[PDB]
Amino acid sequence: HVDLTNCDREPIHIPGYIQPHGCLIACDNAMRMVLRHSENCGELLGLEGDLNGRTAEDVLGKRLVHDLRNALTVTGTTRPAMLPAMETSDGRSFDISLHRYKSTTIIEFEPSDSTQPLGTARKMVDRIREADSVESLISRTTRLVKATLGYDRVLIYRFEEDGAGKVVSEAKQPELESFLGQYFPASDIPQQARALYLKNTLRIISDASGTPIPVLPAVDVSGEPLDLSYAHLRNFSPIHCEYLRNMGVAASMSISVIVDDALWGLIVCHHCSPRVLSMPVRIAAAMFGEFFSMFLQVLKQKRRLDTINHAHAALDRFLRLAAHRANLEELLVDSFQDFARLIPCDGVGLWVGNNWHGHGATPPHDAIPRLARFVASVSEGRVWATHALSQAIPEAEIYADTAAGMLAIPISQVKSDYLLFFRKEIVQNLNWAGNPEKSYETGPMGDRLTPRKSFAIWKESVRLQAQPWSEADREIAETARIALVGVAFHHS
């Protein structure tokens, strides 16, 4: 059905099963007729037999059906309508999620559990609005979510440029192992999963060791499956199921962090026992996720601003000194190390008049002329940067542990003079806070579905590679070029 070969392309949006903590009824575009339903619809709503081919008013009752249909008008959108505490025909009270996607009305029922959403959320959002840095926001959010929603572990996953995830914050029970500073490969969250996570803010798993409920029909006469993209009861991949089971995790709740309309990362809650949050608590958690997302976005913007301002101030100081020095070359020889304040780097060097001066982690004196010649050939009077030097210069491999990434800044419009910034390979700068000799119980699919193997797979994928140069890094580097080229032109 699915394994480690075709799970990168697994159609998770159309599993044909839901989770047992609720029941689902699929109706036509207009919600006149019941096209599909979950096997457990009878056991929960107290109805007998097959509901398929019956009318809406027949199953739910004219009273309820009218309220649902009017909530679709107020909706429009694919964003699901939340209707807490609604009465059926036979009195029973349910929390109802209602959405419409691919002209099919999907209705999800939960036994109602009536918390005030606005109250819980407002308390949480107040405690994060004060945060003055990305670091202060992310560190306090895991601590706050764990305290409020009472999960055993709360992680924040940040997606790197390569799609890999880094655990950037953690609140856990003291007995559980830490994943803080641990990376996981892009493959561990395939593209189709990232799509749904971008479409649904919130994502719940009541019981990883739960019995999934089939949807009937599993496929319709057209050969069309039920697309559960926006359904909160949508069942989960048996691959991820096995991953959570191998970890000692029985329940999960993830929140999507959207920043500049991109999946930035996930707030992920793990529980060691089964756990469902009521619709009200979910509404609050979702509201919190939106505000967390918005606040992180502004802090990201503020951080970028400060970095570029700091770089502009640093370069002004330099240009001021260059006006009061006769010989610019000896100023650059005295000053080049100070340029390490502009761009995060493990080392910086000056290649001027076929002479080399290094500071921090740089290639050995031997390798610099070869590097300088290479830079001169491909630079073309512009900033040149790679995070994978060995892919460009295969003999660079020998010193990757010291310098695996390089950003080159030409400092002369004419002569082949360069300011070089270096970064150690990413595995050298690992501040892993986890357990080396902590092993995991495996399942049918093998030891691939453990954090130990995931981390080991990622570490292999980034061998001989440094932290990629951010757009901020390349923007500053370009501003630094213009400044140095500009003042170098003045001194002739």
Added chain:
Amino acid sequence: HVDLTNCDREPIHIPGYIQPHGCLIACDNAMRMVLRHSENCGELLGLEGDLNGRTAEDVLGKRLVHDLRNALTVTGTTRPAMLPAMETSDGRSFDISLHRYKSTTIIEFEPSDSTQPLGTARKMVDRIREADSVESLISRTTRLVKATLGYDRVLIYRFEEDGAGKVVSEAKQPELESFLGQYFPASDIPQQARALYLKNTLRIISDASGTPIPVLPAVDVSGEPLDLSYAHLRNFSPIHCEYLRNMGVAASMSISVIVDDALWGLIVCHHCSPRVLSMPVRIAAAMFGEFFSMFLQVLKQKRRLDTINHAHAALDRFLRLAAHRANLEELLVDSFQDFARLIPCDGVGLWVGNNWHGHGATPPHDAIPRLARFVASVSEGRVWATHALSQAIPEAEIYADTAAGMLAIPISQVKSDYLLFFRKEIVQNLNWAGNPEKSYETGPMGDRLTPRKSFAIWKESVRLQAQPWSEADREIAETARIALVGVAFHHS
């Protein structure tokens, strides 16, 4: 051959003619054989008969050919090699431009006129490096270029988002008419022209009323024309020829302003008499163009930074006031006009609890509910902006003279409350410094090829449209949303 219907697609890169101020010889990839040559090659180099099918060493002489070939190695690139003051076989001295494109070596000859390039350029670049604003750089550059290169008119053309050009700076002889603040449509510089302008920094027209020199063969046996994309002697469209002649302009020199690898605009020099600049003066002008480009880029970056910082400071002041006010709605009613400092706008309004408050140029009280309802339908809790309101709401047309553009900011996560920013249609804000009753002598193609008709055509194209909202505008608007939504959530 070409007219006002097929000149938007005119193949200007392959005209099959050069300008009479130099001679051109096209050779094979290796520069072993003369494949094509200009008709005037004989009259300038003092050679007799057809040069096509002869060898390189035969025509130019083994001595010269060796020097040219070694300059291609040092080159590589499509960027043309400049070789001032070179001796032919018969003593004659020439300035030689040498490039290779589509595996065809093109050699351009000018009678040498030996200025020091580095000296002229360094003097010019020094006078612009001090500029502390975009406005100070652009205003002094026309004045400086005119003073140094002695053209009759120097304009700077800035390209708008729609491809239209605005004259943002001018230095002219006092008798000539001013084009300052005048716009021209995108069509006046077709896409294929903008491509070449992005490939060649400098572009010269010695004589608009000059006799073009044919290249022989005009087309080769393959059916391939000579691609003169990087040739400085490349002849110009007869459409533009007629434009310059209608204007009283006999010679032109344009410099490409590249900012963030995009054609930002042109430094354009017009002369009323024929005028060619020697290779040295061109080299200097080109160097100046690169530094002008780089300096404008950093100033653009600095301006963006300051604007976003100023917006962040303004919003901090507001959030501070909102903490010390009980009722946020009345604070917004007292304060909304102050938000006009964040985003350039001719008017701003507050739509709160189905009540309207306006300040500056806004739609009439009548039209606001219709607008509010429209914004509520399409906004979807996000910043919504248009520069062409009538295209979205056709009855808006009536008040376009007051408000033709609108940027909407939702200030509530729940209620349909909005902060609206308005801009008058662009023709209302015209500070044209030109002559209304100044008419132009027309040619075969008609009065279309006059600044009077170009301006009139542009004014038609931007009717009922305001100045588009810049990315800076929308970035601030998004930061303002998060702030207002954030503090509105706190007050419940």
